[PDB]
C-alpha cells in the first residue's frame, strides 16, 4: 500500500543559496551519532552459509560507506551456535560502524541482552506486529528490556503504522526511538495508519523525540520527506538486497553513494545544508493524510508557514 | 447502496495488552441484557410448512448461539391460526433466549399485545417504511403502542436511514431503541442518510440511548465499526438464512459462532474489552459521511481524539 | 460466461404464428415432458428443512407439469432421515418426471438403490474431476458409467458440472450407454480461464452426434438462454437459481408463478421467430460470433450451417 | 446502430467530377424521384396541429421536390377531422410523390381508402412484431399484404421497424407483391440486442436480390450514411428527426435549408467519389469491417464483392 | 494513424551483418539517391524567413547528402520575392537531388518553370480534393498530369495529400506517365474515418504494381516507420516536423545531426533484421495485423507472402 | 507477454488416470531427464555470495533430481575465483545434469573450457542481438556455433533471450549442429513491440521440425504455463525468478519445497488432462486464439491440428 509520502509537497526555493558540498547529512538516533541518515535492513534469510556471506557482505559494505547496519532477526541465533556465527561476523567485519541488534516483542530480557552482546551492537530493535500475529505484557517486557539493556531501544511497528498514543507509551517505557516501518486477513486490508501520518502526529506530541521511518522508502526523495515530516534516520532494504544480489558488494556500494548523493541534491536545491534544516522544510500535506491529520487534531499549516 | 461504514476507519492500537479471552461481548438493548451483540433477523417467507421449519431451526440456532432472536412480521400470523404455529414454535424451542416481536407501523395497540403474548417476545419491533409505501397518525400509534405494551419497543427504518430529529420524536413517544436499518422509484435513487451519518447523527444528540444497526452488515468488520459509532447491538439476516439453507442448522451455528470469534478478534486488536470500550474506540471518519456530517453539525473530530 | 450471448438469432419479420399455437413439449431419450424446462433442486442442508423444500419444489413441479432433477442422494443412501427428504418428492409428484442423482464414484447397486428411492424416470450420473481434484482419483469413472448404464431400467443422464463436454467425452458417454449428456456450464488459479463454455459444447457435441439427447443447466439466465441452448441442440435445459429464490420468498404459490412465467416468456420467443415447436426451434437461423465462433472454428465445427438453414 | 460505422468508402483521388455534374435523382420501383431522400413525417398527437405540421412539410416537400411519406393513417381512416390532417398533404402537394401509411393489421379496403385519401403514389405497410408483443398476433400479416397489393393500384413498399429485415423474409415480401422493403433499421430485455443491422440487411437482401428496390429509413444521421445505404443498394432514404426538428425551430424556411443542405452534402460525397449519378453510388467501392462484416461472411454473403467493384 | 503499428517484423535471431556494411542507398525511378529518406520542406509564411530556413535546409540536405523537396512553389511562380527563396536551395544545394513542388491544377507551363526556377531533378504535384472540397472543381485533374507528364523533362511524382492512395488511382497516375506516386498519409465530420491508410495504400499499390516507384511521407515518427514504410515497398521516405523543429531549435548543426541520426537508427534496424540493402529490407519477412489486415484481405491483396518470403 | 494465455485446453472430461501413475520424465536430445522443469541460475554479482547460491541451487537441483543451467561462464573462464563459483555446482551435484553457458561470442576453445569446468552434460550458446545493439557486431555468430558444436562432446543448445525465435533461425542452428533451442521468451523503443512471443515460436519451430528438442524458459509463470509449452512441443522448461525468490527467503528447504510443488502442480494438470506421459502431454488437444492464432495463421502454420489432435 502506500506511505502516504505522495500527499507531501515540498515548497520550491527558488534562491538556495548552497553548494552541494555544504551540505551535511550527519544525524542522531537518541544519544548515537550517525554519518548516515540511512540505514540497511538486513533480512533474517534462510539461514545457513548463504545468510552468513550476505551478512558478511552487507556488513563490509556498511563499514565501508559508514552507515549502520541493522541484522535480521537474532532469536534463532541465541539457541543455535551455527546460525550465530552468522551474526557474529557482521561486528568482525564491521568493528568501528553502528550495527542494531534486533529480536521480537516476545523476547525477554536476558535475550535482550544476550542479543546486544553477540553483535557489540550498539542499539536494539524490538519489533511489534499484532496484526500479523492473530499481547498481554507486551508494553510491560518491552519496560524491561529497556531497563536491563544500557544500548537505545528502538520499537518497530511491521506495517500498520503508529499512532501518537502508542509512541507516547512506548517512550515512557523506556525506547530511544520508535521505528515506522509503514477470512479475517480481509479485515484488515483497509486497517493502520500511513508512514507520513504517523511520523506527523507522533511528532505533534513528542517534536523532541526520535522517529525512524523504514520500509516503503522508494528513493531519496521518500527519504528526504520522511525526514521533513520528523525521521531522525531511514532505513531500506529491498533496494541494497537486490543490488548486492546482483552486483556483489561493489554493486551495493555503488547504489548507496548514489542514493546519499541524490538526497544531498535534494537538499541543496531546498537550501537545507544540514539534517535539521531538512526537518524544518516547508511543505504541504493534502489528500488523505491531510484529512487524517486535521480529525486527529494535529496542525497540517505549520509544517507549511515554517 | 453503501451503508457509509467504508468511510470509518478504526486507529491502530499497536499495545491492544489484552488477550482473546478476556474479551467480553455482552450489551444491553435498553432494559434487556444480551450475551451476544448481534441477532437474527428472520425473514417473513411464503408462510406454508416451510416457514415453519425456518422458523424453528433459527430458533433452536439462537438458542443454542444464546442469541437473540427476531422474528419476520407476525401481521398475517394474527389473523391466521395455521400461521400462527409457526412463530409460537420459536418460543416453545427457544424458551430462555431472547425472542423480538415483528409488526408494520400500521398495527394497533391491541395488535401489538397479541403479537407479543403469542411468542412470549421480550421485545416488539415496529418497522416504518414510507417511501416504499408511497402517513398521519404513524407516531401517534407508536406512542400509544408503547404505552400499551411493557417490553421494550424498537423503531425501525427501512432502508433510508434515520435523522436525528426522527430518533427524538420515536424517544419522545416511548420507543425504547431504534434500528438503522440501511416513474415515482427514480426519485429516490440517491435518497436517504447512510447506515454510519445515521448512527453518528443520532448518538451525537441522544448519546445513553439505545440504537441499533440491522441490513447491509457485511461482516464482522462491520458490525464492529457500527458499535463504535455508538450500536448497542446489530442484526444480521441473509448470511445466516444462506447458512442455514446450505448447510443446515449445524452450518447456521458454526457461521454465528465463526462472526462472533472474529468480532472478538477485532475487539482484541483494538485493546477493546468491551462493548462500551468499543463504542469508544478512536476511529477517524471521511469521504461523503463525514461530509454530511459536517454540515449536519456533528462533530465527527471527537471520535479521533477520544 | 455460457457463450450464448455469442448467439444472435436471425430476425424473422412474417412469423405467421400465434401465441396459442406454440408447442413447448418435447423429448429426453423416449422420456416425454410437456416443458422444455425442468427444475434442478439442491442437496441442501439436511433436516426437515431439506425436506419441506423439495417437498415444496415436488408440488410445484407436479402442478406446473414440469420435470424434477433432485439433489445428489448419495448421503441419503445410508441416512434413513435423509432418505424421507426423497421419498417425499414422488409421493407429492406421482405422475411426473424425476431424475434421480448420484456421483460418478457411484456402483450399479447405489444408482438402483438411488432409482427405486424415488420411482425415477431417468437417473443423473455427475462428473466433476476439476473440483473434487481441488477440494484425487478419476479412475474407472467410464467402466463405473458403463456398469451403471447396462445394470438400471431408466435412461442415465450422464452430466459435466462447470466445464463443458467436448465431442470426444460425450461420445464416450453415448458409446458406454448414456441416454444423454447434460452440459451444466493456488492450484485453483489453473482453472480460472479452463474449460468450454455451454454455447460450445452443444455446438461440437451436436455436430458429431446430431440425433442425440443433449440437456444444458447452470448459467441459464432467463428465457432467451433457454432459447438459444434449444436452438444449439438442447431438447430440455435446467435452473436451480431462481426457482429456489421465488420458493423462500413466495412459497409454493410464488414458484410456481415464476415456473409459468419463464414458459410463457419462452413461447413468446417461439412466436416471434416463427417457431411452432421445439423441433422448429432446434432449426432457427442463427450467427454465431466471438469466442465460440473462434473456439468451433478451430475444433472443425461449421458455423456457417446454423445460419443458412 | 444501424452498422453503417462499418463501412468505410475506398478513397478515389482522381474523382474528375465538378458537383455541377451531380445527378441524384432515383427511382424507386417504377416511380421516378428527383430526390433519394425522403420526409418521414410522424403519426402526431392529432388535432390542428398535427394538421399545420403536416401541411408544412407538404410545402416544404414540394419546394424541395423530394417524397413525403405520412405518419399512419389508421386512425384517419374512422375519425373526420384527423382525416382532413392527411388530405392536406396532397393539397399542399399535388405534384409531388407521397406515400400512403397503414400497419399490416390493415384490409385491402383500408389500404385503398388510405391510398385514396391523399392520391398516394405508393403504400407503406409497417412491421412490427417485436414492438406489439412487448406493447399479440402475427398470423396472416403475408396475406394480408398478399390481398393489398394485387387490389391497389400503387406499388407497396413494406417497411420493418427497428429489427432489420432478413433475405429469406424480403423473398416472402417481394414473391408477395411488394415493390420494394424499407429497413426502417422484462420481456422487453429479450429484445436488447435481437435484430439485424440496416446496413447487413441491406447487403443481405440486395445478394438475393440484386435488381430489388430497397429503402433505408431512421437511424440515418446525415448524408455520410445516406451515401453509405445507397452505396449498399438502397433506392431511396428515409429521414424524420432532424427535418421534424428544423420545422418546430426555424419554420418551413428553416426546414427546406435543412433539406437542401443535406441534398448538397450527397452531391458533395458523390463528387469526392467521382460518382456522377446515383446508379455509380450504388457501385461505389467500399470495404465492409467488425460485425457487419462478420455477419454477411456467416449469413454467406460475399463481402469482398464490394471492394473489388 | 499510418497503420504502420499494424506491421510486425519477422525476428531474425543471425543477422550476421556488421553496422559498417550496411547500405541505405536507394533508387527512385532513374534518380539515384545515397540516402532512403528526405526532407520536405513547409512553403511557410514567405518573406526572408522562409528564405533562411529554405537556405538552411538546403545546406543541410547538402552536407548530408540527402534529397530536399521544397514547398508549394504556385505563388513564387508570380511572386519575384518568393521565387528568390526556392531559387537559393539549388545555389547552396548544386549536387543534390532537389524536387520541385505544384499542386495539380498545375499547366505544363507552370510545371516547366518551378522545375526551371531550382534545376529540379524531379517534380511533385499534389493531389488534395477532400481537403479542397472542405476549404470544388476537381475536373482535369489527370489530364493536366498527363499533359505535365509528357512536356517537363524530369520524373513526375504524384503525391496525394492525407488520404491514401488505392490501387486504381496509383495505375491510372503510372499510366499518364508519373514515373512514382507519393503516399502522404459540419461537412469537415464527413471525413473523420476517411481514406486508405499509409501501410495499406503501399501493401494495395505494390501487389499490382511490384515494379513501380513508392514513396511514403507525412506521419513517419521515426527510423521504425521508414524500416516498415520501405519493407512496404517504398523507395524513399520524406519527413518534415522533426527535421524544421530541429532547425528552429538549435540551427543549422541541430538539423544535420538529426539528420545523421535517424539514418544511424534506420541502420541499426536493418543491421538487427539482416538486411545489407535497401532492396533486402523491402523483402524484409513481417506479419501484417489488424485493421490493416483486414482491409487488404477484402481488397483481394495477399498478405501472407509478407510473412513466407 | 509469451503468449501463453492464447493456449486453452480443450477439456477432458473421462481422464481415467489417477495422479500415482503420472510419469514426468523426459528427454532433451539424447539427453534423459526425471524432470521437464530445470533452474536456470543468474550470473550474479560473484564473490562468495554467489558461490554459495550456486552451492545451494546444486544442491537443491540435485536432491529434487531436476536439471541446473549455470549463468554466464565467461568471467569465470578468466577469473581464478568465479570459477570456484561454477566447479562447485558438479562437486555439489555429481549426479545431476548440469547445463554450461556461454555466449555467441565464444570460441570453440572457450566452449570445452567451460564443458570441463563443470563437467556438463550440454551446453547453452545464448544469442541476444537485439539487447547488445542497445547496450555491435554479428558477423560470425552461426560459424562460430557451428565451430562449437563440431568440437564440443555434448550437445548445444542455442538459446534466444528475449525476443523468440523464427522456424528459419531454427533450421539455420540444427543445420549447424544444435541439438536444441532454447525460447528464453530513443532506440531502445524501436524494439517495444518486437518478436515472437513464446506459444508462437515453439508452434512455428514444432510446424517444421516436429522431431527436433525444443526448450522454452523465461516468463513461465506457474506449472500451467510450463504444461501448456509442453503441449506445444517443448521438452524442457527453464525457471529463475520463483526459484531463486525461495531460496532468499527461506533458505535450501524452501527452495526444494517450491520445486516439489510445481512439479506435483503439474502432475496434477496432466491428471485432469488424462495426459499420462510427457509425450502425451505434447499432444493434448488444444485451441490458440488470438495475437498467436493471427501470427501463426499468416505465418502458414496450422492452427487446427492442435485442437484436433
Given at each position: 500500500?502506500?506511505?502516504?509520502?505522495?500527499?507531501?509537497?515540498?515548497?520550491?526555493?527558488?534562491?538556495?543559496?548552497?553548494?552541494?558540498?555544504?551540505?551535511?547529512?550527519?544525524?542522531?538516533?537518541?544519544?548515537?551519532?550517525?554519518?548516515?541518515?540511512?540505514?540497511?535492513?538486513?533480512?533474517?534469510?534462510?539461514?545457513?552459509?548463504?545468510?552468513?556471506?550476505?551478512?558478511?557482505?552487507?556488513?563490509?559494505?556498511?563499514?565501508?560507506?559508514?552507515?549502520?547496519?541493522?541484522?535480521?532477526?537474532?532469536?534463532?541465533?541465541?539457541?543455535?551456535?551455527?546460525?550465530?556465527?552468522?551474526?557474529?561476523?557482521?561486528?568482525?567485519?564491521?568493528?568501528?560502524?553502528?550495527?542494531?541488534?534486533?529480536?521480537?516483542?516476545?523476547?525477554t530480557?536476558?535475550?535482550?541482552?544476550?542479543?546486544?552482546?553477540?553483535?557489540?551492537?550498539?542499539?536494539?530493535?524490538?519489533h511489534?506486529?499484532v496484526?500479523?500475529?492473530?499481547?498481554?505484557?507486551?508494553?510491560?517486557?518491552?519496560e524491561?528490556?529497556?531497563?536491563?539493556?544500557?544500548?537505545?531501544?528502538?520499537?518497530?511497528?511491521?506495517?500498520?503504522?503508529?499512532?501518537?498514543?502508542?509512541?507516547?507509551?512506548?517512550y515512557?517505557?523506556?525506547?530511544?526511538?520508535?521505528?515506522?516501518?509503514?477470512?479475517?486477513?480481509?479485515?484488515f486490508?483497509?486497517?493502520?495508519?500511513?508512514?507520513?501520518?504517523?511520523?506527523?502526529?507522533?511528532?505533534?506530541?513528542?517534536?523532541?523525540?526520535?522517529?525512524?521511518?523504514?520500509?516503503?522508502?522508494?528513493?531519496?526523495?521518500?527519504?528526504?520527506?520522511?525526514?521533513?515530516?520528523?525521521?531522525?534516520?531511514?532505513?531500506?532494504?529491498?533496494?541494497?538486497?537486490?543490488?548486492?544480489?546482483?552486483?556483489?558488494?561493489?554493486?551495493?556500494?555503488?547504489?548507496?553513494q548514489?542514493?546519499?548523493?541524490?538526497?544531498?541534491?535534494?537538499?541543496?536545491?531546498?537550501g537545507?545544508?544540514?539534517?535539521?534544516?531538512?526537518?524544518?522544510?516547508?511543505?504541504?500535506?493534502?489528500?488523505?493524510?491531510?484529512?487524517?491529520?486535521?480529525?486527529?487534531?494535529?496542525?497540517?499549516?505549520?509544517?507549511?508557514?515554517?
Amino acid at each position: 500500500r502506500e506511505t502516504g509520502l505522495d500527499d507531501i509537497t515540498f515548497v520550491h526555493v527558488s534562491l538556495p543559496d548552497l553548494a552541494l558540498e555544504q551540505v551535511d547529512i550527519s544525524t542522531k538516533i537518541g544519544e548515537l551519532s550517525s554519518s548516515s541518515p540511512i540505514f540497511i535492513n538486513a533480512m533474517t534469510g534462510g539461514g545457513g552459509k548463504l545468510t552468513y556471506e550476505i551478512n558478511k557482505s552487507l556488513a563490509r559494505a556498511a563499514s565501508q560507506a559508514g552507515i549502520p547496519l541493522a541484522v535480521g532477526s537474532q532469536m534463532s541465533a541465541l539457541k543455535d551456535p551455527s546460525e550465530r556465527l552468522s551474526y557474529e561476523i557482521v561486528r568482525k567485519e564491521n568493528p568501528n560502524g553502528l550495527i542494531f541488534a534486533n529480536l521480537g516483542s516476545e523476547a525477554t530480557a536476558a535475550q535482550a541482552k544476550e542479543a546486544v552482546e553477540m553483535i557489540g551492537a550498539n542499539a536494539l530493535q524490538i519489533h511489534l506486529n499484532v496484526i500479523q500475529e492473530i499481547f498481554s505484557g507486551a508494553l510491560k517486557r518491552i519496560e524491561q528490556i529497556c531497563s536491563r539493556v544500557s544500548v537505545p531501544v528502538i520499537v518497530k511497528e511491521v506495517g500498520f503504522g503508529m499512532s501518537k498514543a502508542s509512541a507516547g507509551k512506548l517512550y515512557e517505557a523506556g525506547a530511544a526511538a520508535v521505528d515506522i516501518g509503514g477470512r479475517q486477513i480481509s479485515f484488515f486490508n483497509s486497517w493502520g495508519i500511513s508512514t507520513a501520518a504517523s511520523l506527523a502526529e507522533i511528532r505533534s506530541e513528542f517534536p523532541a523525540s526520535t522517529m525512524i521511518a523504514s520500509g516503503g522508502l522508494q528513493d531519496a526523495l521518500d527519504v528526504a520527506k520522511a525526514i521533513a515530516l520528523g525521521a531522525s534516520c531511514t532505513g531500506m532494504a529491498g533496494h541494497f538486497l537486490k543490488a548486492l544480489t546482483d552486483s556483489g558488494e561493489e554493486g551495493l556500494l555503488e547504489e548507496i553513494q548514489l542514493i546519499l548523493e541524490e538526497l544531498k541534491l535534494i537538499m541543496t536545491v531546498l537550501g537545507a545544508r544540514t539534517i535539521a534544516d531538512l526537518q524544518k522544510a516547508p511543505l504541504v500535506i493534502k489528500g488523505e493524510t491531510h484529512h487524517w491529520l486535521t480529525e486527529r487534531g494535529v496542525n497540517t499549516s505549520s509544517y507549511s508557514v515554517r
